[PDB]
């Protein structure tokens, strides 16, 4: 229904806030490479939040129309985390 639309800037920010270490593994099962992540940590040495958010803007950009919640969901699971975040963060 909405699992086909891409997350917004603000939305990526909220998602990011709720991810711990699993973000790295996550973005991998999503389409980025060690390089992309390294370039994220690169651009925001101090402060992780900013790293993660970029990683995601990174993702959503490389996959345009395809970088969607559906994809996000599948990734969240691939990294063993409840896809509840999505639904709840959507209220």
């Amino acid at each position: 229904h909405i699992l086909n639309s891409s997350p917004s800037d603000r939305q990526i920010n909220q998602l990011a806030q709720r991810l711990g270490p699993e973000w790295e593994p996550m973005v991998l099962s999503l389409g980025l490479s060690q390089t992309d992540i390294y370039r994220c940590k690169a651009n925001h040495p101090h402060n992780v939040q900013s790293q993660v958010v970029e990683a995601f803007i990174r993702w959503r950009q490389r996959f345009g129309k395809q970088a969607t919640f559906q994809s996000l969901h599948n990734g969240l699971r691939a990294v063993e985390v409840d896809p509840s975040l999505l639904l709840h963060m959507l209220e």
């Binding site: 800037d9 603000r10 939040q49």
Partner: protein
């Protein structure tokens, strides 16, 4: 600068200036939640790359200018600060604001 109405209360530059002061590297959050594009958060990080204080400042005061007319202004900020995980700061604003 010219934030809020008579009923809710107003926000002085000194006030907004105080918020910018309590913000750190989590500025981007408050900005995204305030509805600023990510593309823009980045753009500001550039225009003032050597000065954090100014980016935190320019973000605020420019959103301030934008919402210069709007009513729910001071309301949107407080909410954004809450969602950015700074109840901390949301309460100072609600407080100073206490007068209408």
């Amino acid at each position: 600068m010219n934030l809020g109405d008579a009923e809710t209360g107003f926000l002085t530059q000194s006030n907004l200036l105080s918020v910018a002061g309590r913000l750190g590297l989590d500025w981007p959050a408050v900005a995204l939640h305030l509805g600023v594009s990510y593309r823009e958060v980045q753009r500001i990080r550039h225009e003032f790359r050597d000065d954090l204080d100014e980016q935190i400042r320019h973000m605020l005061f420019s959103w301030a200018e934008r919402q210069a007319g709007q009513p729910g202004a001071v309301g949107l900020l407080v909410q954004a600060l809450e969602q950015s995980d700074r109840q901390d700061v949301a309460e100072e604003v609600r407080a100073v604001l206490e007068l209408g």
